[PDB]
Amino acid sequence: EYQDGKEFGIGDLVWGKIKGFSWWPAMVVSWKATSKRQAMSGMRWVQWFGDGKFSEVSADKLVALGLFSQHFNLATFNKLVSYRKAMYHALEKARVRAGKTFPEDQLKPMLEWAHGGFKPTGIEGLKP
């Protein structure tokens, strides 16, 4: 599965771009978790953080969540509570992988950690 030359595999934290929406954090999942069908070649199934729904998204419309400051949308973040909730669950998942520990208020330092480049592991720590 996902043997098509393009990147991103199961478990990868990514940003996903759907028409009409900001880049949104997601996890790449196997089609078996979706209750649907296999993804077409060059597509990935993702599960979106925040609402837990599934979309078949092209790999050209995905980037690693580690490319954070370049895809984090600050306007959308200020405008939409769903996007903030999405960011929380995405970064929380990121934190546990990277073995990072912290002391809306919970978000603030995870956001800073993410925006600052996921110190000290860097993006390496975000891998599944």
Ligand SMILES: C[N+](C)(C)CCO
């Ligand atoms: C995460 N999006 C809002 C882009 C789609 C949710 O199903």
